[PDB]
Design a protein around this ligand. Structure first.
Ligand SMILES: [Cl-]
Ligand SMILES: [Cl-]
Ligand SMILES: [Cl-]
Lengths: 244, 250, 243
């Protein structure tokens, strides 16, 4: 351990996974996908009670890196699409499957896939200078991260559409109101308050946390995986299109 | 098919800026939906579904969004009596709701004033709902001895939480625009004086987005769910047929 | 004829009142049985509307701690299996109740008495009511269908702070998060709720019952399956080191 694009630390029964490309506003590139997956696969097995994701610097994440498309393979755009789809599908699935309580500490602006995944977390704490933006249809794409299913359930289809289809950008307050964020904190004391709270959580009976989440999450996974898959076919097609 | 605007008796249907605008137009009768308007609304959507607008809006003329079903749809009695009137109204309603379940473009309600009954329950099928601060929402079904429809027995609990949906479908609490926005039914409320302006500016923008992206995105959200909604619709209609032949309705 | 409840019927409203105010209305083995018999009764009688409420200062403190300590001939193995069967059957009554069901939350609520709220048709609370499900704190898993209903009602984000991390909600929070229908100031709480309920009871009776039926029926089979699953996982949690 061992990471180029992340900083993975483990203290107090809390594994903290920190995006670490602050220069590029924590954009998620092909390597970071793989690293995130390995970090979660690792934290799912270790003996931490609780797993956090957060961003280094001013951004939570700007979502997918624009350079994941431009690197072109031997089978042309046909194969790059199919390869990205496979990777994405697998990537989302790790979140669907993660067995321990998973928490997002949103430290600043979030975009794209980093936002859509938030529907799979167990809690989401945000600073009052975080924002949430999924401008999919602006860039000719469809939703992913299961968001086509989770976001209507969480926000109401009325509010979900303004965001997935019309690309409205939410403030932390709005996102909290619309169910996406668990709580907002003023920026100055953001880091302190979350961590105090997380530390307490990590002191709760460990199998109880793991089993409780199991009961809430299990019955629902098969559906999510099927949504993931469907989302990915539609996304593969969207990438080979004139509008993208 | 049609060129810029379509000939209807109870509606005004126009197409401008990749937006198809369907307006209820019986402002004298608070835009009450009568048998003819049902048919026209279906033909209007069928049209908007096939033309080359990006976005479809539903709105009311005058002060009301709609008062819901027209009371005069019951009194016009056929040769088979109330038995057949009920069966016919149940068939029409089922088919009518179905159009909304199946509509493939983004569908938006511009609620310019008080909405009632079917005009409210159908809101659970829309993609956005923008309301003026003097819009209200009211579904007093059980008060007139009836059961819910528009898929609202499924969508309203999902959207509002069963706790809040019941005060509305079962106990006929009327909501203000702000309440309805808070409870998930309305996307956004606007002050009346600037309501029309604001909504249309925003809509014009939306219409400028990549057309196939909007259509495909909606499809991904909406498709896996239709089969269930059609089932709910069907079930709501049988239960409603029954309710119309009962003592509590008269 | 009830030991732990007070069941009355007036104005087409059946009122079921928890009545162990000395013990903060804790639900013991007997009260489970009585609540079931009371509902089974109210389901068949000619009331339009059924209310649950608490005597005294508490709505309910949830399960009584003395339901575990009374030990049977088959040891902890059988106690667990019996409690699981009872609980499953008990929750089922709420899943199945056919008339409109309303909780008048007069004060603090805990545990099973909170989780069941996801099954009610309305929930009116006094501004001094609170809602707390500290399951994982006592090494247990959720029940009352709450592992399914609470994410649907509150959003998984907010449901988790409650079922997994045991955050205690105030009535205002609970109302905001979708759990409670409306909050009333304590001084006029009783008055206001009953006025409203008396009105509701004057609505066309079959319309109420049929409307509820249309909202609720398609959804029961799932809830029963959730209830069952929740109970097996709970049985296991009782035979564990963390409990
Ligand atoms: Cl990718
Ligand atoms: Cl009709
Ligand atoms: Cl028990």
């Amino acid at each position: 351990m061992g990471f180029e694009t992340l900083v993975v630390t483990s203290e107090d029964g809390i594994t903290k996974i920190m995006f670490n490309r602050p220069k590029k506003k924590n954009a998620i590139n092909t390597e970071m996908y793989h690293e995130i997956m390995r970090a979660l696969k690792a934290a799912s097995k270790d003996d931490s009670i609780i797993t956090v994701l957060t961003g280094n610097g001013d951004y939570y994440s700007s979502g997918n890196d624009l350079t994941n498309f431009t690197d072109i393979p031997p089978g042309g755009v046909e194969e790059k699409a199919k390869n990205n789809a496979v990777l994405l599908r697998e990537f989302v699935g790790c979140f669907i499957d993660f067995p321990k309580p998973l928490i997002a500490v949103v430290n600043g602006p979030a975009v794209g896939i980093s936002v859509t995944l938030l529907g799979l977390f167990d809690a989401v704490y945000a600073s009052d200078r975080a924002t949430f933006h999924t401008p999919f249809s602006h860039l000719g794409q469809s939703p992913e991260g299961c968001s086509s299913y989770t976001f209507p359930k969480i926000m109401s289809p009325a509010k979900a559409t303004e965001m997935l289809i019309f690309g409205k950008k939410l403030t932390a307050g709005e996102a909290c109101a619309q169910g996406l964020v668990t709580e907002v904190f003023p920026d100055s004391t953001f880091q302190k308050e979350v961590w105090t709270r997380l530390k307490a959580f990590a002191k709760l009976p460990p199998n109880a946390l793991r089993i409780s989440k199991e009961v809430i999450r299990k019955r629902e996974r098969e559906k999510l995986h099927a949504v993931n898959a469907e989302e990915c076919n539609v996304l593969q097609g969207r990438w080979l299109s004139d509008e993208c």
